[PDB]
Amino acid sequence: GAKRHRKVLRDNIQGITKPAIRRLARRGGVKRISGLIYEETRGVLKVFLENVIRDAVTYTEHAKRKTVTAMDVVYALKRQGRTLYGFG
Amino acid sequence: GGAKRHRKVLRDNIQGITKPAIRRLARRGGVKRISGLIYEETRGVLKVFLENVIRDAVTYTEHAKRKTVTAMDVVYALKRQGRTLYGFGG
Amino acid sequence: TRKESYAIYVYKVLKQVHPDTGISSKAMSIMNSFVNDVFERIAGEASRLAHYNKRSTITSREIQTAVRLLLPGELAKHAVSEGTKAVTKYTSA
Amino acid sequence: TRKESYAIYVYKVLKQVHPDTGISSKAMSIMNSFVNDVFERIAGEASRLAHYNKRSTITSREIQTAVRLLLPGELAKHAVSEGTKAVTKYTSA
Amino acid sequence: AKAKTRSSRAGLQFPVGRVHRLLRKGNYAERVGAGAPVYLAAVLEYLTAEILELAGNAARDNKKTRIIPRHLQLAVRNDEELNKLLGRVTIAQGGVLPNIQSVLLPK
Amino acid sequence: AKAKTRSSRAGLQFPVGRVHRLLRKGNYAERVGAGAPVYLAAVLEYLTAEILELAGNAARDNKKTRIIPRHLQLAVRNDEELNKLLGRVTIAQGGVLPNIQSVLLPK
Amino acid sequence: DPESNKKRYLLKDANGKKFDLEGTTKRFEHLLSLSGLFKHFIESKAAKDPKFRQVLDVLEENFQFRESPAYVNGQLRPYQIQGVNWLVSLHKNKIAGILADEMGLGKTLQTISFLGYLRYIEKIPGPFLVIAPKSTLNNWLREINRWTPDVNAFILQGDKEERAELIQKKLLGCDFDVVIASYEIIIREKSPLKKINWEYIIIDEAHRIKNEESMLSQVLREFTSRNRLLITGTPLQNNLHELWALLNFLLPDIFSDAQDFDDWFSSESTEEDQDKIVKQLHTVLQPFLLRRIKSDVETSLLPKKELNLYVGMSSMQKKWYKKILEKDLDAVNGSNGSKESKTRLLNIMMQLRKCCNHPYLFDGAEPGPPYTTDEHLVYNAAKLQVLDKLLKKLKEEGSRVLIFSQMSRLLDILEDYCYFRNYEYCRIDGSTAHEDRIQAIDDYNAPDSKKFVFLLTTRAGGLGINLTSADVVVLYDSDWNPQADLQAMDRAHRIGQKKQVKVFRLVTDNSVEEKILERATQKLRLDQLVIQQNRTSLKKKENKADSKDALLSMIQHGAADVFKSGDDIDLDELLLKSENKTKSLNAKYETLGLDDLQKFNQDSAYEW
Amino acid sequence: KPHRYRPGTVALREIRRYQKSTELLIRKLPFQRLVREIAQDFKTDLRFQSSAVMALQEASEAYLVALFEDTNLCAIHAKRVTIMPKDIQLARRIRGER
Amino acid sequence: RYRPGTVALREIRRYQKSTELLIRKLPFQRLVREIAQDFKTDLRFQSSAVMALQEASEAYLVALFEDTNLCAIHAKRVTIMPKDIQLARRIRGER
DNA sequence: ATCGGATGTATATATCTGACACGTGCCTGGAGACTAGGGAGTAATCCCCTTGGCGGTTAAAACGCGGGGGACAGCGCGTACGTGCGTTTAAGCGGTGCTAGAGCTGTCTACGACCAATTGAGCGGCCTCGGCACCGGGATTCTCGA
DNA sequence: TCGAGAATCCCGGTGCCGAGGCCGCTCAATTGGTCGTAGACAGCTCTAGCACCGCTTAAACGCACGTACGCGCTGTCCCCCGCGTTTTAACCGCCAAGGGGATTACTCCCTAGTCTCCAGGCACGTGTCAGATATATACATCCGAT
C-alpha cells in the first residue's frame, strides 16, 4: 500500500515491440540479431513516418479538408519514389 | 612471313581506362590501399553505366530524326536515369 | 457517382489468356493502379518528348518512343510490335 | 537567334547580395540550369495539385503548397514568407 | 449509320475512346493525334496480358484458380524483366520471395 | 498611362511576365491565375539569393572575387538544406568536398 | 440418465423447416382468440408466400401456482409467483414471452422457478441453454446451486483445451442439465451447440439482440429449438425496429417481416394514424411482454435518503480553476460568432470537471517531488476535506461506504488517502479482471470482515452486482445520464437490504458542477411525466435548444466570480444549508420548472 | 533431459515461415497511435481514414523489411552472422538516406 | 624513403582538392563511340555530349568508390576488394 | 623520446591573356484598355464514415535462465601491394582536305477541334453458388543426443 | 553412433462470402465545317568525321625490396538464443453522435482573348583586371639513428 500512484506511460514508439522488429528481421532473412538494434529500428521508423506524414498533411491542407484520405498518403509516397499499388 | 595486312592490334577499348586513372578516381574517393582485382571490376561497372545512358540518349536523338547525339540528349537521358546534371545547358 | 476504371477490360484480357481463372477484388485494384501508373508514365514521357521537339501534338511516334524509353528490353520490343500491328489494322479499317 | 535565360536577373540578385563579387560563365550556366530545374519541379507539382483537386487553374495557393512540398525546412519557411510578401505588395498596387 | 467502336476497329480490348479523352484532358499536349489512343491502348493491352498470364501460371503452381496479390508479387519478382519496371513499386499484401543466404545454413 | 512592369509593381527582380508566359505555354493547367507568376518569381529569387550568398562567402574564403563552379559546389555541399534539395544533382566541374576517414590517418 | 439424455438431446434427425400447419396455425388461432387484431400480417404473408397461403387456407373455417413451489428453496414474492404463473400459461399455449421486470427484481429467480416447473412438474429435463454476459455467469450458477439444489448446471469457461474437454466429455456426452455460456462463447462454439435439439434458449439482458443483423443474432437464428425466454430489465425503447427484431426472434412465425410491419404500423400518411394505433400496439404487446415495476409491487424497503452536499471550492481549487479559465476564456466568453468547435466546448467542460473534482488531476499541481501522503491534499480540496470529515463521522458511528467516482485517477487518489487514513478498501474499476473482481467482491460481502469502505466507478460498477451490506452511497460527482447514477446507488438499494439507504452527492458551489444537478433534474424530471400520462406542461420543448449554447451556459455558472476574483468544514451547517437549498430546487422544478427550466438564458461573462 | 533445439534452428524455421506469408507483421493499434501522435505536430485536430493508416503500415513495413535485408548483407560481408547498429548505419548511408 | 601509406594520404589530399577530369580524353571518347556502335550505326557526337558523358561517369565512379571505401572499412580493413564494389552496387539497387 | 635532415608545401611577386562586365539598337513580347463568358466561391443540404468509448478471448509480449557458440583480441607468417627508379608509349596539339548534318526562312492541305443529336457501351445494384479458408487426423521428414 | 520427438505436408469434410452474372440508365461515335499545324520546300552557315602526318612531354609500364597487412588459428568469455512462465493489451464485436465530404445552384468576377502600344532584354561588339603561372623562400612534417 506504500506504492504511490505514478501512472507512467510508455512512449508510442515503444509500441513497436521487440518481437515485431524480430519478425520484420526474419522476413528480411536475418538469423542472429544483436540487442542494440531495436533502438536503431525505432529511430529509423520514426524518421520515415515523419517524412511521409508531413507531405500527406500538406496535401490535406491544400484541399481545405480535415481528413487524411488514403489517396493523400498514396500521393505522398509516390512523391518520394515509393509508389504503392492497391489503394488507388 | 607476310600476312601483316590483318589488323591483329588495338587492344580492347575498355583497357583505355588504365590502372593509374582508376587509382586517381579511388584517391578522389578517399581510398588508401587498393586491391589488384579492383581494376577489372571497375571496368565492368563503368561499361554498364555507359551502356544504359548511351542507349537512352540514342533513343532520344533518333526520335527527333537526327543522326547526331547532342549534349541536350545526354542531359535528358541522365535526368531520365535519375542523375540530373548541371552545366551543359538544360 | 461516375467512377470509371479498367476492371471490365482487365477481365476481358484475363479471360482471353487464361480462360478459366478468376481474380479477386484486391488483385483487380492492383491491376488498375498498374494500368494507370503505366499510362501516366508513358503519357508524361510523350508529353516531354513533344515539348523537347517543339511539337504540339501527341502522335503515334511519341508513344512508340516513350515505350522504347520506359519498358526494358524484350518487353519494349514486343510491345512496340503490338502497337504497330494494332494501329495498322485500325488505319486500314 | 534569341535564347532567353535567367542571366541578368541572377546577376542583379548577386550584385544585391555581394555588391563587389563577380561570377564566371560556367557558374552562371549552372545557376540558370538550377533556376530552370526548380521552376520545373514547382510547376509540375502545382500542376498535379490542381489536377488532383479537379481544378483548371493554377493560383498562388497551388504554388505555395508546391513550395512547401519541395523545399526542406528552413528554405521552405523563408521562401513562403518571401512569396507572401511579394504577392501582398503586388495586390496593394 | 450503325456505330462501330474504335476498339472493335483496332481489334483491341482496352477502350480507345476513354484513352483519347484522358489524353485530351490531362494537359499532356494541346492536340492529340488520331492514332495515339490506339497505340497506347495496344501497349497497355500487351503489358496487362503479359503480367496476367505470369500470375495465372503462379496461381496454378500454387494450386488455386484465382489470382491474388501474392501471385502478382511472385510473377513480377520471379520474372527478371518486369522486375525492373516495377522496381520502386511496393505491391500491397505481396510478401517477399523466399531467400536465405547460404552462409546462414547449417553445416 | 506609362507602363510599369509587374516585377517592379511587386518589388522583385525576377521577371514576372516571363514566368507568366512559361506557366501558360508550358502545359501545366488550362488557366493561370494572376498571383502565381508573382509568387513563383519571388520564390525563385529567394533561392538564388541564398545559394549565391553562400557561394560568395566561399569564394572570398579563397581570396577570389568570382564564383566558380567549385564554390557553388562547396556552398551546396556544406549546407545541410541545399544538400538535400540538390542531393541527386551533379554539378559539372564541382569536384569533391575534402574528407578522409579517421581510421586511415597514421598513428 | 446419460442414456436417455443422449437419446433425446442429440439431433437424431437432420432437417431444415419442419412444421407445415399445426404449430403455426395453433399459434395464430390462439392469438386471434386473444384479441386477434393482427390479420394484416397473416394475409400479407399468405398472399406473398404460397406456404402460408395454404396455411391460411385452413384459417377460414377451423398447475396454476397458487403458492410458491415446494421444491425450490424458500418462497417467492407475490409478483414473482404471478410471473411464474404467466410463464407457465404461455408454455401451455405454446407461445413464448419477454420477462421485462425493472432491474434488480430477481427475474433470474423467476427463470429458475420456471425451469423448476419444467423439470419437476411436466418432466422435461431437456437441454436448456442460458446465454448471459460474462459478469453474470457466476451469479447464475450460484442461483442454480441455491434454489434448485440438484441440477447438473455447468459453466462453459476456459481456453480452447478445457472448453473442448468439457464439450466432448459432458456436452456431446449429454451428461448435463443446463449449459451456461457468454455471448462470445456462444459465437465460438457454434457447432457443438448447433448439434443439440434445444428445448429452450434463455437470454439474460437481451439488449444485445436489439440489432437484428448482429452476428450473435445471425448465429442464434439457426439454433434449432422450440421456445425462448428472453429477458430484458430495461424499458423497451420507443423505436420500433428493435421491437420487431426482438419479437422476430421470439416468434418468427408471426413477425416474419420488417417492411410490412412498418407499413402497417409506423409509416403512415398521417402521424395521428400511428398515434391512435399506439392503443393497438399496447393491445398486441400485452399478452407477451410481462413487466413489473419495483415501485408498485414492493415497498419492502425504506425508500431512500437522498441527501445533497453543496460543498465549497478551495483556494488552490480557485487557483487552478482560474488557470484553466485564463487558458480557455475565449471560447466561453460568448464565442467567436458561435464558431467554437463543440469538441473544444466539451474539452473545456472536462477540464473544469477535473479541476472541480480535485486539483491534482493536473500534473505539476502537487508540491515538489518526491511526494509524501498527508493531509496536505485533503485541504487542497474542499471536497476531500468534507468527505474526510464525513468518513470520520460515519465509520466511527458504524456504517459502510460505497463511493462512486466517474474516472479512475480520482479513485486512485481516494485509495491513497484512505490508506493514509488506514481503512481497508476494495476497488472494482473496469481494469480489475474476473476471479479478481469476484475475489474482491466476495471478500467484501463475506461475513464479518475488515474491509470497511468499498470504491467503484459507475460504468463498471452497476452490472449484476449485489453489494447490499452497506448503506451510504456517497457519490464524488454525477454524470449526464441519471440512470447510471441511479443504478450505482441501487447497487446497495435492492432486495434484502434491512437498513435505510442514505444517498450523498458532492456538489461544488459556484462552479460548473452546481449546474449539473438542475440540468440533470430537468432531464430527470421530464422523463417520469411521459411514463404515466405521456404529456405534461412541458412547454420547454427546446431541450436546452442547443448543445453548443447549452454547455456554453453550463460553463458560465461561476464565470464572473473566480475570473474577477485551517478553514474547517463544520459539516452540520453544510448539511442544513445544502438540504434547504436542495428542497428549494425540488420545489422549483416541481412546478414544471415554469419560471426558467432553460429558457436559453445566458450571456458572456468571461469578458476580461 | 528435455528437448532443446540448438541455436540457429528455430531462427531458420521462423525465416521460412515469414518469407512464405503476406500478413502485416506489426500490430495495428500501436502503429495507428504512433501515426496520430507524429501527425499531431503538423496540424492539430486531424481526422484519419482507415485505408490511410493501412497504406501507411504497408509502406512502413515494406521499408523496414528491405532495410533489414540490406543490413544482413552488410553483416555477412564483415564475416559475422549478427547484425549490429553499425550495419544499419552503413546500409542507410550507402542507400543515400543519411 | 617514405613509409608505406605516407604517399597515399598526400595523394588523396591532392585529389580531393582539385576539380579537373581524372580520366583521359581520347581513351574515353573511343570507348563511347564503340559502345554506341551497336545500338545504331552511323552515329555522330557533339563534343559537349562526350564531355557531359565523362562528367557523369567520373561523378558516378567517385561516389561508388566512396561507398566502397566505407564497405571496406566496415570489414576492419583499409584495402578495397571487389567484394566491396559488389556489395555497394547491390545495396544501391543497381544489381 | 629526441634531433637533424631531407622533402614537400604554403607564401609573396611579377606577367599576361582572355573572359567578364559594359554600353548600343531594336524588335518582339509584356503592358494597358476592353469585352464576354464560364469557373469557382459561397450557401445550403445530406448522409457517410470517423470518432470515441465499452467489455472479452486469447495470442503475443515480457521476464528470467542456462549454456554454448559466436565476436573479439592476440600471434604469427607469408604474400601482395606500395614506393621509387628507369623505360617506353600514347595523349594532346597542330595542321590537311572535302562533305554532309543541322539549324534558319514560306505554301500549301489534310487532320484535329467544335458543335449538334442520338444511341448504346459502361456503370451501378442485386444475387447466387463455387473457390477458399477452417479444422481434424495421418504419414513424412528432419533434428539431436545417446 | 540411430531411435525419439517435434514440425510438416496431405487428404477429407465444412462452412461461408466474394466474384461473376444479369438488368436498367447515360457520352463516344456520326456528320458537317474549317482553320492552323506541320509537312515540304528552297537557302545559308557552323560542326563532325575519316584517312593521314609531325612533335613534346608527361604518364603509364615494368621491376625489385621489403613491409605491413590480410588471413588463418587459438583462446576466452560473455552475449544472444531457445524455452517455459506470467501478464497485458490487441483484436473483435458493439453502440451512439456528430463533423464534414460530397453535391447542387447562382452569380459574379476574373481569366482568356483581341488590339494597340511601347520599352526591356537580347545579340553585337569591346576594353581591362582576376586569376593562372612560374620563381624563390620559409617552414612544416616525416623519418631514421641515437
Ligand SMILES: Nc1ncnc2c1ncn2[C@@H]1O[C@H](COP(=O)(O)OP(=O)(O)O)[C@@H](O)[C@H]1O
Ligand atoms: N424471493 C427471493 N428471495 C431471496 N432473494 C431474492 C428473491 N428474489 C430475488 N432475490 C435476489 O434479488 C437479486 C436480484 O438479482 P438479479 O435477478 O440478477 O437482478 P436483475 O433482476 O436486475 O437481473 C438476486 O441476487 C436474488 O438473490
Ligand SMILES: [Mg+2]
Ligand atoms: Mg440480471
